[PDB]
């Protein structure tokens, strides 16, 4: 039903979870993963638990997984639909990358938000021009939406 | 067909292309004229970001269409 | 009072050139390109007009977009940054001649670059390629195979031939007899394996004839692809190598920007040009040469980060999604820099900055530059958005 790579990736995610990340396959769809990422220490998301869904497209692993935040989060690299601005620079996705690699990068993005186009992303404008207030807003949203939510 | 590529500085260069060429091929032709690696480029047509694997025909790019070459991107 | 009683060394050093372009880039950003602020504002309105709200007070809607624009911030295209360095140090005529000369592939130990650095003021331009080889394959019948419309940079397994459709759509045979391909073709029958990847480490050849065939095809392609030109340019930078008095005292200074990472301004502000200069000529070239000969992803990522990360991110630049799995190729070209014209070129840019965007400090000259760009953008948007 599934290529061995997906089976073995799933097995290793369950037996050897990424620190601060819970990722489990859907019981009715083995290509679908329910993810929780803990807010990193010393980030404005500290103490929060953020739900995400991850889907393995038909073309995986030649195509990257599709990931979205399901929990509201105030972050300059996440848009209003929960899509994430990551993407390996000056190269493309390759089967040398795996699900664990994507999840680690999202968690790293929560510690080190990168700049973004202020246009069509007001969160990026706030992070650039009023970082202390933008961090203050991210903390409030973390308390409101990302606590006691699991 | 001839198409044009315009930058933020108003500089315009002319490319000779085919509707079957991919965006990757267009970026290689921009490298040949400006010495800019394809990985250091973003191309926009009428507000739409152009993706590497698609073709000019996929975006309905035609003769004398003007693409915008973006040379600063954060994200 | 000491102005008229003192003279100064009339001879221009290469070190003077390095410090002045570094100083001007640090303090003036895009303004060192010499483009009028109103030009940037007019062209920025063209690409950003779709972001303006269409209803309500349009003067306020336009000002929000004008305030958020980053039009006067410098390019972070590594190629565009190299172009501007060439234009200032060589002049536009000299840079046009330089752009036509040939790139030379860096040898395994970097010797050919070492042997191309005579003791005068030199500019080196580098273009690094990554090996953009195919990663996927598809089984297809010859009746249904059309290279004009099929996906490119991909392997196609037919019943009697194995071919590679390259990035330009050219079909390249991969040297397999029809006996081999008929075997591989009819052994791969599982539905999700008719269109899959070439180098899946979880495919065990001992498990079945299907996995044995997929594994055999993977070994075939990796060997054949070593002889095919799949190089695509990924990074660009320049190196200023000033003339010294002694061979033991020769240093180099790399200049670069980097897509979605940093500008030449930030490169200079973090003093990474001076940090890399501490490696010396041969030490830097040796790391550069090892970048192209290593086949270990971790070593390739460690060197890439050390050489090309923004200052301070050396150990996290090529990790995770940014681990360097592709083989790399370094190409270079060299030409001489005349310090007299380069310093003159920079002084003329300083005049343009001082005449058109005057101020008491660099910060205020840049703010005035951005304001003038914003005012031009405002006028353009006010006309465009009358069209409902």
Residue numbers in the entry:
A (entry chain C): 3 to 152
B (entry chain E): 1 to 75
C (entry chain A): -3 to 384
Sentences from the paper on this structure:
The product complex was generated using Ub–Ube2N product isolated from a MavC-catalyzed reaction mixture where free Ube2N and Ub were linked via a γ-glutamyl-ε-Lys isopeptide link. In the product complex, the 310-helix is highly extended, with Lys92Ube2N positioned in the MavC active site covalently linked to Gln40Ub via an isopeptide bond. Notably, the methyl group of Met317MavC occupies the position vacated by Ile90Ube2N as the 310-helix unfolds. In the product complex, the aliphatic portion of the Lys92 side chain is held in place by van der Waals interactions with Tyr254MavC (inset) positioning the ε-amino group within 4.2 Å from Cβ of Ala74. The proximity of the backbone carbonyl of Thr230MavC to Lys92 also indicates a potential hydrogen bond that may stabilize the Lys amino group in a productive orientation. Though the side chain of Lys92Ube2N is well-defined in the product complex, the region of Ube2N surrounding this residue still appears to be dynamic. This is inferred from weaker electron density and the relatively high average B-factor of ~70 Å2 for the residues from 86 to 95, compared to ~40 Å2 for the whole complex. A further pendulum-like rotation of the insertion domain maximizes interaction of the E2 with MavC by pulling the E2 closer toward the active site, as captured in the P65 substrate complex and in the product complex. Unfolding of this helix brings the Lys residue into an attacking position in the active site, as captured in the product-bound complex.
